[PDB]
Amino acid sequence: GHHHHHHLEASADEKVVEEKASVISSLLDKAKGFFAEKLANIPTPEATVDDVDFKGVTRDGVDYHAKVSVKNPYSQSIPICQISYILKSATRTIASGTIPDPGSLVGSGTTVLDVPVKVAYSIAVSLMKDMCTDWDIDYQLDIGLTFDIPVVGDITIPVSTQGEIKLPSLRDFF
């Protein structure tokens, strides 16, 4: 493809994503030890990433609609103030980001929220294998959404999800 013979810290995009990711992972890590003891005594809503819908394409990577379901028994609308977006692709390169308010909890119930996910985009910006026809790609999605509660403050719950995506024989969808 075209992603070859470029040397500026390997690739500025590939590099700057890691910059962001490193800091993001540190904030996720503060919450990790926090969950174990504090959020076991402090009832907090649980979120989870589920699946991605084959939806559309972007000229770089694909544009999917991923599900993030949150279930919360509390009759209050908790908005997700700061949602950490971590898109991954097999071995190397990811796409990191943070979306301000992607949705809110309905109050007492389960609610599926969605985020625009750039799938395969990561491996594309890095090297881009060569879009094939009928391609099972090793994809992962990790999301750390932040709930705010007067009990403590900010809790970023990183719900990790690993799977696989089958990218069909369009060949010009990637």
Side-chain angles (χ1 to χ4, degrees), residues 19-157:
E19 298 288 78
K20 303 174 182 178
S22 184
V23 182
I24 295 178
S25 301
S26 303
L27 181 164
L28 298 177
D29 180 81
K30 68 71 180 293
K32 179 179 179 60
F34 174 107
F35 302 146
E37 67 181 285
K38 191 178 306 304
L39 297 192
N41 292 210
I42 309 307
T44 43
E46 181 180 83
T48 186
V49 178
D50 291 288
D51 175 60
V52 302
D53 302 303
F54 177 93
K55 188 289 298 183
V57 62
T58 305
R59 295 297 179 174
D60 197 82
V62 309
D63 183 78
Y64 283 11
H65 177 260
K67 296 183 181 299
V68 182
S69 309
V70 186
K71 57 184 176 296
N72 170 87
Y74 288 104
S75 304
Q76 61 177 32
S77 54
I78 312 177
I80 297 68
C81 305
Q82 175 187 270
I83 184 176
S84 180
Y85 177 95
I86 301 179
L87 170 289
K88 292 180 172 176
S89 299
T91 309
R92 285 186 57 194
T93 308
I94 66 169
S96 53
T98 304
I99 301 177
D101 185 92
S104 301
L105 281 51
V106 296
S108 299
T110 177
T111 178
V112 299
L113 306 177
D114 67 85
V115 293
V117 176
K118 306 290 70 172
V119 178
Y121 178 95
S122 183
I123 181 179
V125 62
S126 187
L127 64 171
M128 191 177 186
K129 60 183 294 64
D130 181 86
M131 177 54 183
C132 186
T133 49
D134 177 276
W135 168 225
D136 170 81
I137 182 180
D138 182 84
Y139 160 91
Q140 294 77 87
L141 174 52
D142 299 331
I143 294 184
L145 62 69
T146 314
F147 294 113
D148 63 93
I149 62 294
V151 183
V152 185
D154 66 277
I155 58 177
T156 53
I157 303 178

